[PDB]
Design a protein around this ligand. Structure first.
Ligand code: ZN
Ligand code: ZN
Ligand code: ZN
Ligand code: ZN
Lengths: 375, 377
């Protein structure tokens, strides 16, 4: 498996956001041999790669990221998350599902396509970033700004995120929910635990509020997007003293929202609920992504047949899960379709992908190139 | 021209003695008590320093108890002046330990020095029981000194703990008892995953929110005519390393109970587990009984404190068991009468901790007169 060998080479590189750690160089050295023009684009602390073969349209673009989320408790892993290995037909490692195995399949699919169809039509491109998991202010969004300023348009963009639920290619995504980040800083007064009346405990004042936020119904979604969901990712207060009341509580939460609401409506109902609990605080809001939905066209049609031909599965469209760099590519007019491995273990400890899906995914990606650029 | 109590207070406050580092504080005290006939017996247990200074070999035995350790500062960006750089602003002495409790240590030493100067033929014995770990776990501090004194039958008649016992004015409150202190480190187990795929994970913050909300507004007891009601407080809460799209695998919640004699530690541990199990939480708790509730009899020590305080400030002191606890919890089981008397407790464990300089000399005079009312007359 050429896909398995390239996957292991990428999975061994600790690439926690926004560190690339040679992943874009490993990919570039491979593409540079099959006629791709390598164009690195570093913005601040983020590395990006724009690789392209051909100068005419239509332009097909494989998109993806080399960064992975933090590993977490290292003693909770059955094997070093950056030491990939196979156990009972399962490749374990951070990035094994999200999404270094797809980066590899996209590269192998491309090499095999250029080999069988060297005089293909249009162009093939690779838009890779080292920050898709974090703030994402210096990743794909800045590469797109560069392409847009020089009138370089993408016709079809397949994002290799793990779109599958139960079996390979059972779900393909042409849109995604918005993402609204927040950092709530509830103010209290540092003092003695046995003299609470002389202090203000922020954990105590905020508990009923965070409890209400967790059970709050935001919207019921619609026929194109699932319902808006609220999730607290981090919460911190105290320095470790058992007899000291902490002076400040920091709560980090996020909203994956449908088109039934706007970032401004969520911001307003949240401040209303916090003020209702009479809290004193500061919030640093951050709109990480807008809800987006690209039209259903030939890319979706090429994927329905490629997926059906390789797995025998009838794919279904959805805007479920998180988001992707497709949110920064969609505004250019490119059709966006996300097709990848199972998302069952993404961001989890002992993240893994079934090895039997690596070759088929590569086959599916190669058939999408044939269905759009061969003829 | 700084008073003797302020002078020694500054010398002790200049020592960054975060638990359990003594940072020479017990040597500063011992070098002075040694000049007025106090035998010096340092007792080091693990990384904790302790001092048993004793003047006299016969009873009754009066003991000054206190600690040289202070709680951590946190960061100098919140402090108007360096917390280990004692300074005076509008008659207020600022610095870590200025109220809890280095100013009382200094007063106790100056009081002892002046008492030995006027009453060299006093009866009984005077002793100091000082530890460098009263603010932390306190497993190698006063509890070990008492273990050592008890095994050799060395009993303390009266013990005055210099903890800041006052509310609005010096000596308005003195304490002969304290509620218990029950610590816990609750670890709610969830399952790390993607925030956008919550059904494939388990958010421990979300599961614990309703449970934590109920504990914060729960009524444990109504206390009694000797102790205030049991209070619950969360000191620390932690989950996540910073990723905004990752559901954390576990939530760590550190909490404490200051409890009255209306409940037992086992009764509190049983209610907490019922409430957590009720919310279907998967977890583990590490309990640590820091101190049992204690109440010592009202005797000569109280009578001597009422007299002294009244004579120095014109204030009729009032008994209480309010606030946190002290090393009196390790001394009370020996049979010694325990009474806590000190400066205002309004700024202890707070940023910009300070003490009114006008209370330093009167406090010294109070301690000196307690020695006179118990070992001279
Ligand atoms: Zn991804
Ligand atoms: Zn991800
Ligand atoms: Zn103290
Ligand atoms: Zn203290």
């Amino acid at each position: 498996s050429d896909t398995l060998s390239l996957s292991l080479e990428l999975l061994q590189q600790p690439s926690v956001t926004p560190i690339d750690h040679t992943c874009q160089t490993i990919m570039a050295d491979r593409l540079a041999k099959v006629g791709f023009h390598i164009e690195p684009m570093r913005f601040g602390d983020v590395d990006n790669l724009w690789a392209r073969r051909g100068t005419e349209g239509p332009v097909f673009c494989f998109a993806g990221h080399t960064d992975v989320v933090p590993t977490g408790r290292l003693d909770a892993w059955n094997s070093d998350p950056f030491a990939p290995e196979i156990r009972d037909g399962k490749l374990y490692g951070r990035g094994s599902a999200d999404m270094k195995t797809a980066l590899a399949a996209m590269v192998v699919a491309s090499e095999r396509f250029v080999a069988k169809h060297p005089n293909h039509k249009g162009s093939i491109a690779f838009l890779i970033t080292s920050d898709e998991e974090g703030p994402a202010v210096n990743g794909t969004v800045k590469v797109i700004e560069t392409l847009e300023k020089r009138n370089e348009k993408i016709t079809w963009c397949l994002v290799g995120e793990p779109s599958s639920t139960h079996k390979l290619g059972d779900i393909v995504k042409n849109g995604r929910r918005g993402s609204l980040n927040a950092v709530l800083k509830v103010q209290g007064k540092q003092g003695h635990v046995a003299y609470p009346h002389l202090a203000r405990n922020p954990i105590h004042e905020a508990s009923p509020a965070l409890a209400e936020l967790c059970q709050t119904v935001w919207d019921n979604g619609n026929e194109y997007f699932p319902a808006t969901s609220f999730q607290i990712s981090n919460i911190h207060a105290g320095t470790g003293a058992t007899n000291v009341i902490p002076g400040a509580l920091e709560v980090t939460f996020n909203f994956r929202y449908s088109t039934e609401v706007t970032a401004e409506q969520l911001k307003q109902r949240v401040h209303e609920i916090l003020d209702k609990h009479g809290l004193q605080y500061e919030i640093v809001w951050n709109l990480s992504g807008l809800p987006f939905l690209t039209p259903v066209g030939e890319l979706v049609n090429a994927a329905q047949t490629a997926i059906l031909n390789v797995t025998g599965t009838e794919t279904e469209l959805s805007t479920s899960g998180g988001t992707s760099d497709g949110r920064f590519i969609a505004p250019t007019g490119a059709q966006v379709l996300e097709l990848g491995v199972l998302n069952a273990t993404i961001h989890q400890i002992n993240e893994h992908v079934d090895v039997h899906d690596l070759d088929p995914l590569t086959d599916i990606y190669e058939q999408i190139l044939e269905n759009l650029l061969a003829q």
